[PDB]
Amino acid sequence: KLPPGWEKAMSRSSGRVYYFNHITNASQWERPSGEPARVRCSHLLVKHSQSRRPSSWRQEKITRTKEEALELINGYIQKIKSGEEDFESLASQFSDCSSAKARGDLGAFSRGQMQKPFEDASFALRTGEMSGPVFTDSGIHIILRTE
Ligand SMILES: O=C(O)[C@@H]1Cc2ccccc2N1
Numbered sequence: 796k797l798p799p800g801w802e803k804a805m806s807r808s809s810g811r812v813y814y815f816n817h818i819t820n821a822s823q824w825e826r827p828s829g830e831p832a833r834v835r836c837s838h839l840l841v842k843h844s845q846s847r848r849p850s851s852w853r854q855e856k857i858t859r860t861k862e863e864a865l866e867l868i869n870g871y872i873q874k875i876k877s878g879e880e881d882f883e884s885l886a887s888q889f890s891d892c893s894s895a896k897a898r899g900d901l902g903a904f905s906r907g908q909m910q911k912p913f914e915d916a917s918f919a920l921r922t923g924e925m926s927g928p929v930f931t932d933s934g935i936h937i938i939l940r941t942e
Contacts, residue, residue, distance in 0.1 A: 800919045801827045818919040819938070820927030828921065835942035836917045837882065837899035841867045842891040842934040851891035861935075868928045868935045875925070875937075882925065882939050891934060903942065913938065 797803075800818035805811075815822045842849060842857045843864035849857040859867075871889070874880040886899030894901055906914055910931040920926060920940035929936040 798827050798829060798921075816919065816927075819916045819924075820929060821920075821924065822927060830918055833903045833905050834917050834920070834940055835903040836901055836920070837886060837939045837941060838892065838894070838901060838913075839868075839871060839882070839886040839890040839899055839937045840892040840934050841865075841871075841889070841936075846934045847932045852893055852895065853889070853891055857891065864935050865928060868937060872925075872927065872937060882937070899939070900941070 797814070800816040801814055802817065804813055804815045806813055811824070813822060813824050814827055816827075841864040842851055843859050843861045844857065845861055846857065851857060867889075871880075871885050875882050875885065883898035887895055889895075890899055892899070904917075906918065908914070909917065910933065912929055912931050913936060916926045916929045916938050917940060920938065922940055922942060924940055926936070926938040929938055
C-alpha cells in the first residue's frame with residue numbers, strides 16, 4: 796500500500812484522513828510519495844533530566860523534564876512547518892548537540908553507527924523529509940534528511 800512506516804489515520808478534530816509514520820513520528824495531510832547504503836541528516840536535540848548526559852554547550856546542568864523537552868520539540872516543529880523559522884536556524888540556536896555549530900549537520904552515516912531509533916527514523920525519511928519527535932537515550936530529536 797504505502798511506503799515504509801506509513802499508515803492512515805483519522806483526525807479527531809476534523810474527521811479528515813491523514814498519514815502518520817510510526818518509525819519517524821511524521822504526520823501530514825498529504826498521501827506520501829511512492830534502501831541506500833548511507834544517508835546524510837541534520838538534527839535538533841533537546842535534552843532533559845533523564846538524558847544519558849544531562850549537559851550540553853547550552854547548559855552545564857540540564858534540568859528540564861522529558862515532558863518539557865517534548866513540548867519544546869513540538870513548538871520547534873510547529874515553527875518549522877509554518878515557515879516562521881528554518882530548521883537550520885533553530886538547530887544552530889537551540890540544539891543541545893555540538894552539531895548545532897554546523898546547523899545540526901551530522902554528515903553521512905550508515906546503518907550500525909547511530910542509536911537505533913535515530914538510525915531507523917533517519918533511513919525511513921526520504922531526502923528532504925523531516926521527522927516528528929524521535930526518542931533516544933540522548934534526548935528527543937527532530938531529524939532532517941538532506942541526502
Ligand atoms: O547517538 C546517536 O546515534 C544519536 C544521534 C546523535 C547525535 C548527537 C547527539 C546525540 C545523538 N543521538
